[PDB]
């Protein structure tokens, strides 16, 4: 999306690293190879820098039946910071990422990887009494999302229900 926009337009992109898996770094390198003025920063500076950010464009892993997001960790914080400044939040996700599962519960939302990413094993005895948790995904309520951009165009989060009904049958929600 950004590379297509950058062919005819000039803009400045700020990428959060999304610790512990600092994939954002790679996202910043590729955008730098396209000539886009890009800036890298840790997830701690999201709220500080949000005051000077005009638009927020993010991906997602899953779009729930009510328009909510199962995105990378730290995305809920970014959405809250954007909502504080009334910055629009745009989710660029294709049609096949839409899941008819509501976020009721099921205790299977977050994906907890090994705590080696957060606290190294070389810490020592400190690890025998410390509870380290490394969730991978964050739940973003639909109230903080402004627009969904999919292969069929732009939609509001309030219309996602319709995209459910014409894609999946209610009897097939629970396999």
């Amino acid at each position: 999306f950004l590379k297509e926009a950058a062919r005819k337009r000039k803009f400045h992109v700020i990428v959060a690293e999304c610790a512990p898996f600092c994939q954002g770094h790679e996202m910043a390198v590729n955008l730098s190879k396209a000539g886009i003025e890009t800036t890298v920063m840790t997830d701690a500076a999201i709220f500080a820098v949000m005051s000077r950010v005009n638009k927020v464009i993010i991906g997602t892993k899953t779009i729930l039946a009510n328009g909510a997001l199962r995105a990378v960790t730290g995305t809920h914080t970014l959405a809250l910071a954007a909502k504080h400044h009334s910055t629009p939040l745009i989710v660029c996700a294709p049609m096949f990422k839409l899941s008819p599962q509501f976020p009721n519960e099921e205790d299977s939302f977050h994906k907890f990887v090994a705590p080696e990413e957060v606290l190294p094993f070389t810490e020592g005895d400190i690890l025998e009494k410390v509870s380290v948790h490394c969730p991978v995904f964050d739940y973003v309520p639909p109230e903080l999302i402004t627009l969904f951009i999919s292969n069929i165009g732009g939609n509001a989060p309030s219309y996602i229900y319709r995209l459910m009904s014409e894609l999946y049958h209610p009897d097939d929600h629970v396999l």
Binding site: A65, F102, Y161, R162
Partner: protein, 301 residues
């Protein structure tokens, strides 16, 4: 059927099954009126049904009765649009009305099955007034081996909150009754709010027992989820803009219808905007408020 017999049939239908909703009983009475009708034209039947709906609304001022009557009117209109002959139209109307009654007799079970999975284990639920749908949802949650605590508002002046508390105590659920004024004091304890609805307006908001609007506002202040459970026949084509935009016939009871102990005839319902509602659990499934309008836009036109 005459007006007196219509009123007697409606009241008897309500009395025989206490758990039966007012809108369902009104729809069944309207179907009985259609069966007993003697006219041989669509317009005469429509006028007679409109008079019957007015009689029933005079008997019961709830928004549910009016929405059920409007739904039945739209149903007969849809039946008449396809079929030009009135005899076949009436036969198909009777059959589809029986099927409609059979289908809407099961709305509460579907609502409970869909909603009971939203109650986290070891959570606190705040409820306003009495609601059979909420009671069924909590029954389903209990039957799923979930432990939760309940706070119920008193819901002055009829004190239906105490009745709801007794009903929940029948199910062996820890239930605590609070004052209405204490709602803002107790919201910090509630994990989620579940309320019924006397009617779902076009925009997705609800018209419910007085005190629901301030509960929704307090929940929005503390970022607590606000869930509404309501059947599909409670959908109305109303668009209030504020509290005074709600029709007066709904605020004040049937028998009910200055500056010194006036009390201004305390309203019985208020309007909660869709922005204060998280989700709706209807017999059509789990919906966002914006979906509600869709169900009406496709229903008419």
């Amino acid at each position: 059927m005459d007006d007196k017999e219509l009123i007697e049939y409606f009241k008897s239908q309500m009395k025989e099954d206490p758990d039966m909703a007012s809108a369902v009983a009104a729809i069944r009475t309207l179907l009985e009126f259609l069966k007993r009708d003697k006219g041989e034209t669509i317009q005469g039947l429509r006028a007679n049904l409109t008079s019957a709906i007015e009689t029933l609304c005079g008997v019961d001022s709830s928004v549910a009765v009016s929405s059920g009557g409007e739904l039945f009117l739209r149903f007969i209109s849809l039946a008449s649009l396809e079929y030009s002959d009135y005899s076949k139209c009436k036969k198909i109307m009777i059959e589809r009305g029986e099927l409609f009654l059979r289908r809407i007799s099961l709305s509460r079970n579907k609502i409970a099955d869909l909603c009971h999975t939203f109650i986290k284990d070891g959570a606190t639920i705040l409820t306003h007034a009495y609601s059979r749908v909420v009671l069924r949802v909590l029954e389903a949650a209990v039957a799923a081996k979930k432990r939760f605590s309940v706070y119920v508002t008193e819901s002055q002046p009829d004190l239906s909150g105490k009745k709801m508390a007794k009903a929940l105590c029948h199910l062996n659920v820890p239930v605590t009754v609070v004052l209405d004024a204490a709602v803002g004091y107790i919201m910090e304890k509630a994990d989620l709010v579940i309320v019924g609805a006397e009617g779902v307006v076009e925009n997705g908001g609800i018209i419910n027992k007085i005190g629901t609007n301030q509960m929704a506002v307090c929940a929005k202040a503390q970022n607590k989820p606000f869930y509404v459970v309501a059947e599909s026949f409670k959908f109305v084509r109303l668009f209030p803009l504020n509290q005074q935009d709600v029709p007066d016939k709904f605020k004040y009871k049937a028998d009910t219808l200055t500056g010194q102990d006036l009390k201004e005839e305390h309203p019985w319902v208020d309007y909660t905007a869709p922005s204060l509602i998280t989700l709706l659990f209807t017999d059509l499934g789990v919906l966002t408020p914006s979906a509600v309008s869709d169900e009406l836009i496709k229903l008419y036109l």
